[PDB]
Structure formats: C-alpha cells, structure tokens
Amino acid sequence: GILTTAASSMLEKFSYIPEAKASCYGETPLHTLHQFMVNVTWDG
Amino acid sequence: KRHGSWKIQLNATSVTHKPNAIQMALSVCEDLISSQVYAILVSHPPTPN
Ligand SMILES: *[C@@H]1O[C@H](CO)[C@@H](O[C@@H]2O[C@H](CO)[C@@H](O)[C@H](O)[C@H]2NC(C)=O)[C@H](O)[C@H]1NC(C)=O
Ligand SMILES: *[C@@H]1O[C@H](CO)[C@@H](O)[C@H](O)[C@H]1NC(C)=O
C-alpha cells in the first residue's frame, strides 16, 4: 500500500517515473521515491 | 619457509577487475567460498570511478 500510494502520488509529478535496470551484466535515475514518501497514511 | 614442515599448505587464488559491481563478488561467491578461503585481499588503488 505504501509503495502504490507513493507511486500514484509520484505519477502526478512525472509520467515515466517507473524505470528499471537494463542488464545485470556488461542515465542514473533522479526522480525516485527515496525523497518523496516522507509522509504516508495507508488505511488510516 | 620459517614455520617448518607442518602439514598445512598455502594455496593462492586471485581474480582481476570487473567494471560492473555485482559481478565483482558474483565470481567471488562461487570461486573463493567453493575454494574454502580464509581471507580475501582487495588491492586496487586505481579505480575508474
Ligand atoms: C589451488 O586450489 C585449487 C584446487 O582445485 C586449484 O586452483 C583452481 O581450481 C579451480 C577448481 O576448483 C579452477 O576453477 C581454477 O581455475 C583453479 N585455478 C588455478 C589457478 O588453477 C589449484 O589446484 C590449487 N593451486 C593453484 C595452482 O592455484
Ligand atoms: C503529506 O505532505 C504533503 C505536503 O504538501 C501534504 O500536502 C499532504 O497533505 C500530506 N499527506 C499525505 C499523506 O499526502
């Protein structure tokens, strides 16, 4: 619930927030949930 | 040499650079732990990062 709430609130700020790693073998993200979900209220 | 003729022996196993960070220890966890190592030595004073 906390991850879905933070992602839903982050989607309003920017569309292509979900980005993942290309390959484990062989553009660093700047807008993640590390600095965004400071407050959260799931199910009261 | 200076410890005489005790039954223990000393074997060495060394690996080199990997640019990716997970594949540094990905080789280590099945090479050295499978080799029953006692100590691992990291000796890289140049890094690209
Ligand atoms: C040190 O112990 C191992 C025992 O096999 C040998 O070295 C490695 O052996 C593994 C298989 O367990 C191989 O995958 C590696 O390629 C081997 N490395 C080397 C450098 O051969 C080896 O017999 C022993 N002594 C030496 C020479 O490292
Ligand atoms: C969290 O903080 C923001 C800051 O603007 C505030 O508007 C909001 O009411 C707070 N509550 C949640 C959990 O969204």
Check: CB of residue A6 under 8 Å from CB of residue A16: no
Report the atom number in ligand 1 closest to the C-alpha of B12.
28
The reply to whether B10 touches chain A by the CB within 8 Å rule is: no
> Which among A23, A35, A10 has a CA at the least distance from the CA of B22?
A23
B22/A contact by beta carbon, under 8 A: yes
- Per the CB < 8 A criterion, the answer to whether A17 and A11 are in contact is yes
Residues in CB range of A44: below 8 A, 6 or more apart: none
- As a whole number of angstroms, the distance between CA A36 and CA A1 comes to 15
Name which of A27, A34, A29 is nearest A18 in CA terms.
A29
Method by which the model was determined? cryo-EM
